[PDB]
Input
Amino acid sequence: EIGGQRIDKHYNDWFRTYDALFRMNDDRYNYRRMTDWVNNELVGAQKR
Amino acid sequence: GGLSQLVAYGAQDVYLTGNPQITFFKTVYRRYTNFAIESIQQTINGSVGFGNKVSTQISRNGDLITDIVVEFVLTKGGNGGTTYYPAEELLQDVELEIGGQRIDKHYNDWFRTYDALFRMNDDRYNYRRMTDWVNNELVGAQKRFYVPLIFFFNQTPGLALPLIALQYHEVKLYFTLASQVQGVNYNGSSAIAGAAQPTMSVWVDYIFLDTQERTRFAQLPHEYLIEQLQFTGSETATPSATTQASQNIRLNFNHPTKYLAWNFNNPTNYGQYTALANIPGACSGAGTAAATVTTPDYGNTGTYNEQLAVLDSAKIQLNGQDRFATRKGSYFNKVQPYQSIGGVTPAGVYLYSFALKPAGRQPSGTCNFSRIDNATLSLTYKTCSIDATSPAAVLGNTETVTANTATLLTALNIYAKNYNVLRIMSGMGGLAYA
Amino acid sequence: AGGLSQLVAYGAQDVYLTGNPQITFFKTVYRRYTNFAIESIQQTINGSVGFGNKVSTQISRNGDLITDIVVEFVLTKGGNGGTTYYPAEELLQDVELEIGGQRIDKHYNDWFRTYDALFRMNDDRYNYRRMTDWVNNELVGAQKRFYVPLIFFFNQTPGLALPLIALQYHEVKLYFTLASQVQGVNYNGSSAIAGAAQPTMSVWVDYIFLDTQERTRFAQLPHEYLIEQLQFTGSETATPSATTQASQNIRLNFNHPTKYLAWNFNNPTNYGQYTALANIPGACSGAGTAAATVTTPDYGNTGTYNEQLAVLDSAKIQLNGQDRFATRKGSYFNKVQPYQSIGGVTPAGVYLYSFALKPAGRQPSGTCNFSRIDNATLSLTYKTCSIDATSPAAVLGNTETVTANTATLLTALNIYAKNYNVLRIMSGMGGLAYAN
Amino acid sequence: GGLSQLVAYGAQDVYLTGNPQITFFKTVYRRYTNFAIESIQQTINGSVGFGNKVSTQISRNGDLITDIVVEFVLTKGGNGGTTYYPAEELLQDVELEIGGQRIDKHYNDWFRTYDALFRMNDDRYNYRRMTDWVNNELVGAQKRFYVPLIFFFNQTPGLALPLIALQYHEVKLYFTLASQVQGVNYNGSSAIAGAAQPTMSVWVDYIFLDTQERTRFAQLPHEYLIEQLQFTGSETATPSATTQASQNIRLNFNHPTKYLAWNFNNPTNYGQYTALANIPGACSGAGTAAATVTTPDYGNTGTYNEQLAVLDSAKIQLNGQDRFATRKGSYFNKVQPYQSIGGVTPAGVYLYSFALKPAGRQPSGTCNFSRIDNATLSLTYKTCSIDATSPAAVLGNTETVTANTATLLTALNIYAKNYNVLRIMSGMGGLAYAN
Amino acid sequence: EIGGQRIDKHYNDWFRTYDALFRMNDDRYNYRRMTDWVNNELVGAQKR
Amino acid sequence: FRDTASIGFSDTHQDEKTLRFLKKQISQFIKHLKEYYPNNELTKKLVMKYSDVQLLPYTKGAT
Amino acid sequence: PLLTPSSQLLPKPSPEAADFAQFAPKNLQAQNFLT
Amino acid sequence: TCNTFSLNVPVNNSIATIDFAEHVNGAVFKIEYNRVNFIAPSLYPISGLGTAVVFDLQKGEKASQRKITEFGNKDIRIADEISDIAADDHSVLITTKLMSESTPGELSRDVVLNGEIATGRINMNTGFVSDIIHTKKISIIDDGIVDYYVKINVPAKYSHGIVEVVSGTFLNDIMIHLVRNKNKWALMDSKMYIVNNTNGFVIAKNPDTAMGVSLLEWPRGAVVFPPYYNFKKFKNVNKWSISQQIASCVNTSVKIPGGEYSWKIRLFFGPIWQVQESINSV
Output
C-alpha cells in the first residue's frame, strides 16, 4: 500500500504461477536456486 | 372503541393536544454525508509478550478513526472458573499519544471499573464473552479475545479523530501487557509451566468520507469536546479487630470532572474488590471441606454482596468544606449508579457523580478540580473482624463489620473522567488545556 | 478496494439519503448548559420512627430545585434466607406529597411493586431489589441499609425538578406511613418474630443549586409544569372455585388525562404475592419435597413468571358502555402490552393496558381523559380454580382457562391509574391547575 | 455543600457553561395530535393448520396501522425442554403486500436472527415468554402465544401504514404455518399422535386520528422511508476432517443496505446454529450415560459457546475487491453486535454492519448493492474433527476446530436489511425502487 | 359487524332465553326440532 | 385496485359522546329542563344531530 | 366536473374547551409596614 | 422572556434623569404661575397654556414612542402616552400622579395605538397595554419659561423615541432658528418640512407671538465616542415633532439594557423680540 491505499497484493501460488509462466531458461533455474534446495542436500542443512 | 376516547376532549387537554406542535405518526429523516466503515489491521511495533511494551502508529488509511479493538490469542492453563477477564487484565496500560503529547491513558483496572459501572445487561455479558472463558471450558482450551477500547473517540462517531487533517502529529498508542495473568500464566503467584506467550493484533475502524465533506475535514480547523481519565493509585489501611480506621485521602485531579469512581483491591487478584469468604462463589472451594479464603473462585471474583466490601462511609471534602453530607458505603455502591447509570454495580466498586448522566456524551454537570487547591476523599472503613470461614457470621452479622480477609484490599484506585478540548488546525492536533 | 469501494458504488437511490446533506455523524456539537451543582442533604423526621407509625418531614431549602428523594432504612433479619421479599417496600406503606398544604400525589405499598414489576428493566430493576431486599441468601441477624428512591413526577428526571426557589411562601412536606408488620422482620406469615428491632429511617433529598442568572430566572418568572400523578382506590375481587367462571364489572372513578391503567390481584397476607401458590420450584416453602406447604410461599421468590398461576382469563375496558377494545386474554395484559409499550418484562399477576404509545416516557404520547366520561368499567373474566396445587404434575399440565385452587387467596384487587396534571407556580405560591 | 463546586468556576468551564443555551432542570414538552389506540381481530382467510397457507386481509378499521401481533394456541406434545419457540417456528413466514406488490417478507429463521441480534435485555426474555414454554411445563399444558411481527412499521408509530391514504388499496399479510413444529407435532422427527391443530387469530392495533389530522393524512401524498428484508436460502460447505473448507457465496442484493447477517442452520432442528456436544444443555441428556449428540436439548438449543460454531473466518468483496480485511468468525458473532447494537448474540449467528446504528431507523451508513456488480461473501469453516461425545475434547480445544456433529448445519441463510421508499398518493401506493 | 362497528352480539344463553321467553306455541316446538334430537333418536343418529 | 371510498372505522354515523353532551345542547337551546322540551322541538333536535363533510379531490391523466 | 369521495365528520367534534387560572397576589409586599 | 445579554450593549450615557418632590393629587391638571396658565383635561398631562391666550384647544404636548420597525416606516408600533384614537377615553394605566402648584408631573404606562388588531399591512403587538414606562414633568419657572422633561424605559431596547408631538393652531407659518455658530438667525419656512440637525440651536415659530423650542439634553453613548449610531433630529412640519433614534432596523449586534433615559426640552413663548432676546443670551 501507498499512503494507506492497497494498490497490489501477491500470493505464493501467484509467485509460482509467474515463475511457471514468465521466468524462463537460466533465469528460472537461478530463481529455483534462490527459493529451493537444488543440489541433493540432506536433512539438517541450513540454507539462505 | 377508540373513538370513544378521541371525543373525550376536556379542559385538561388544552395542555396536551390543543394546537398540536408534534405529530408522532409523521417521521422526518435527515440526509447525511455518504461514508463507509472499514476494519483495518494495524502493525504492532515491538515484541509482543507478557511484561513487554509495544506500540502502534495508526496508518492513515481513512479520514476519521472511531473504534479500536485489541485482539488477543490466549490458551488457559487452568480449568473452568480459574480465569476472570484475562484479556482485560492482560491489556495493562493503553496510552493515547498525538504528536508527543499524552491525550489519555487507561489501565486494566479502569476497564474493569468501567465494565463494573457503565456496561449494563446484555452489553456487559457480551463484553465478558469477548474477554473471558464463559462456558466452563477446561485446561488447554484456546480462543481469540477482543478488548474494545473506551477512549473519547471510540464509542460515538461524533468525536472521531480526523487523521485526514491531522498530518504532522501522528496518532499512536502504547500498550503494556501484564506480566501475570490469572489462570493463564499463574494460579495466584504459582507459575503455570508451559504457558504460551500471547498473540496480539490491534484493529482500528476507519471512516471513509465522500469528496465534498472529505475536503472540508482536510481543510477546516476542528475542535472536539472529549473525555480524559485521571489516575494515580494509592495504599490504604484496613484493620482487623478493635480498630475502625478512617483516612483523609488526598486527591490529584484538575479539569472539569463528571465523577469519581473507586475500588479497594487485592493487588494479586485482578478484579477482587471484596473480601473472600466460605460462601457460594466467594472463594475457592466454598461450601466444601476444601474451601479456602486465601484464594478466590476466580470466575466468580466479583460479587454483589456488600457485606464483603470494606467502605463504611465516605465524603468528598474540597479545601476543608464537605461538598455533600456523609454517606454510608451502600449509597456509592448501589444508589448513585442507580441515579446516574441505571445498572448494577458489583460490591466493592463505588461511584460518586457530579454529572446527571455521566454515561452520556453531552456535559451534564462538573466539578472543576483546577479551582480546588486540596481535594480529599474521606474514607471510613468497616471493622474487619468476621471469621471469613464461618457462614453463620459472614451471612449474619451487622452492617458495619466485615470479613477478616478484607484486610488484604489495600490498593485504593480513584478514577476521574474530565472534559478537555482537542483542537486540530493546519495538520497539528493538541489539547487546549494543560 | 476497502471502504473507498463502497463510495464508488453510488447511485440514484442514494441521493434520497445523502443528497445535499443536512447532518453529519462525525463532528457533533454540544449545547452549553447552565452551571449547577448537586448536593444530598439529610432531612429531619417529625415523630418517632417505628412499625405502624406515621411520621413526616418538612423539606429544608438548601437548594433551588429538587431532583430526587431517597429514603434510608436500617433493618435486621428476623429469619434465614428466603424469608424476605422487598421488606423495605412493605415497610413503606405510603408517601403523600403536598405543596402549601395541597396534595399533589401519593404512592402506595403494592404500587412500588407494580412500578418495579412493570417499568424498571433488568439491571435497574435488580439494582433496585439490591437496595430494598436481601439478595445474597443472608441469614437471620444480618443487618443492611436499604434505600427506597421515590418515583414522583420530579424524581429520577432533572426536567421537572420541583422549584422550591419558586415556592417562597409555601411549605413542602412528605408524609411517610410505616408498616405495622414486615414479612421476615417482624412476622413470618402471621407468626410474630420475638426480638424484632425497630427500624432506623432517614429521609434524604437531593438538592440542585443553580448559578446566579438562572437562580434569578426561577425566582421571578411564572412556571407551568406538566406532572404525573397516581390515582388509586382498592377493590374487591371475585376469584372462582370449581365448575364456575367468575366475572366482574369493576366501575372506575378516575378523573384526568391518563397514560395507563395497571393492576394486579393479591393475597393481602403476603406482600407482593400476585399469583397462586403451587408445589413447584420457588413457589412454596419446601416446594418439591414432602415438607412442602402449598399455603405458604417461599417468600424470597414470591414473584414468578408462570401466568398459569394467575387468575385473569380476560379483560376489557368499557367507556360509557362502549367497549374500548375487543376482549384480550390475561396474557396480553401481562406480556404483549408491556412488550410493545415499555420494552421490559412483567411478572405473572401484574397487568397493563395503555392509552399512551410510550407510557414509560414523560412526554405525552396519547391519553384517555376520564374527566369527560360517564363511566369506565374494567370487566374481568377469571380462570376456574380447580387444579390441585399440591401436585406439580397438575399445575404444569393444564388448560388455559383454569388455575390453582390456592388462587382464591388473591382477594385484593388493586387498579392503578397514572395521569397528567399541571402544577402552576406563581409569586412564590404553588398548586394544581386541576384539583386532584 | 454544593456551592463548593458551583462557584469553583474557571477557564476550563467557559466552553461548558458560558453563554448558556439549555437548562437541564426545566423541560419543555410538545403538545401532540389527539389519537387513540385500539386492538381488534382480523378476518382470517383460509384453513388454519400445520403446513397450510392462511391469508389475513387487514380490515380498514382505522386511520393509521402500527402494531400487529399474531396469536396462536398450542399444547405440548412432550415434556419440558422439548420445545423451542414453537410459535416462532410455527409462523414459517409472513409477507406484506400493498396493492399486490410485495413490500417485505419475514421468515421464522429470520425471526431467530433478529432475536439473536436486535432484541435484547428484558424484551428478549419476555419475547420468549410470548412464544415458548419457559416454566418447565409438562406434556398436556396449553398456552396462548403471541408473535409480534417485525415489519418496518411494527416498532415505531412514526412509520404507521397510512391506510386512510390508501383509499384504493388492500393491504394483506400472507402467512405460512409450518408442518414441522418441534415438541407439538414431532418429538425430534417422530410424529406425536393426537396433536391438535393450532388456533390462530391475528390482532392489529389501529390508530384513530382526530378531525384535522384525519384530513391531512387523507388528502396529502406521503413518502415513507422503510425497511425491507432480502433473502434467498443457500447451502453450506461444512467439512469432515483434515481440511478447512471454504466457499464463495454469490450475493444477489439491492438497495441501500444497513447490514448483512447470516447463520448456518440444521434444517431439521429449528434454531440450531451450532454443533451438538455432550456438554450440559448442549444436547439431549448431556452429562449422563443417556446423552446423545444427534438430538438437541431443544429448550436449550441456543448457546453462547462459540466452539460449537462452524465459521472460522469471513470476508466480503465489493466488485471482486476486498471490502475489509479477513476477520475470524468470533468477530461477527461477538464484536459487531457490541459495536453496532449493544446486546449479546448467541453462537452461530453472525452480523457485519455498514451502519453506525443499524438498530435505529435514522439512516447511518449503507452499502448500496444496486450499484455493486459483484458482491461476494467468503466463508471459511472450522475443521470438524472433535468427537462431540467427549466434553474433555470439546471444552479443551483451540480456535480452528469444532465437533464432528457440526456437519449437520447444511442450510446457509444470508439476510440483508435494506432501505426503500413507499410512495403513496391519491389513494394509491407503491415502492420507489425495484431491482 | 357493520362498517367496522359492532351492532350486536348474541350468546347461546341468550338464544335459550329468547326461546324460553319470546318464542311460543307451535313455533317453539318446531324450534326445538330445528335445534335438537326430539323423536327419541339413539346413539349414532345424525341430524341436520 | 379496490374501490372502497370509505374506511369503515365507525366514523360516519357514530355519535361518540358522553351524555354530558346534553349540557352542550342545553347551552345551544338555552333552557335546561329538557325532560320535556325535546318533545315539542323535534325538528331542531334532529337537525342538531346531522353531519358536515370534507372532500378529497384528485385528478388523473386521461388517455 | 370532478367526482370526489366524502369524509363524514358528524357534529360530534364539538367546540374546544378553555382553561383560566391565577394566584391572587396574596404575597403583596413584605416589610412594607408593621403594627 | 428571560432575555440575557453580556457585552453587546454600547455605553449609552443617561445624562438626563427625572425625579419628583411634589405631592399626590386626584386626576385634574389646573396649574398656574406668574400669569402663565396651564390646563389639561387629565386625558394626558398637557392641553394648553398661555397668558390670557391659548395656542390650541387640543392635541397638545405629548410624549410618544416607536418600537423597532422594518425601516422607520410609519406609525405602526407606536406606544403612546394616550389612546388618542379613542380621543375621549384614556384607556391607559396611569400609575402615579404627582403635582404641586406651578409644576405638575405624571408617570404612566403606555399603550400601543393600533392595539392587538392585525391591521394595515403587518400584525401588531400582543395586548393594548405595553410594559414601556414613561414619565413627564412640567416645571414652570419664574422667568415665564417652562421646562418639559420626559422619560422612557423598557428592557432590551434599540428603537426610536418620539419626544414631543405637538399639533398646535395651524397659525404657525413663520419658522426661524438661530444657527449654533451664532452667525445669524436663519429664516426658513418655504419647505414646510424642514429636518433640522444640530445647527438648529433653538427654533421658534410665530404667526405674530412666538413659541420657542430649545432642546437641552438627550442620551448618547459618547463616553469614548464610538461609531455606534445615536442621533437626534427634528421633523418640522405643520405638526411639530422631536425624535431620537437609537439604531436603524437591525445592527450587527445591538441592545440597550433598558434603564431610565430622559430628554430635556425648554419651551417658552412671548413676543418674538423677547423669545429671541432670551435665546441670544448664548
User: Anything to note?
Assistant: Chain H has one helix and 19 strands.
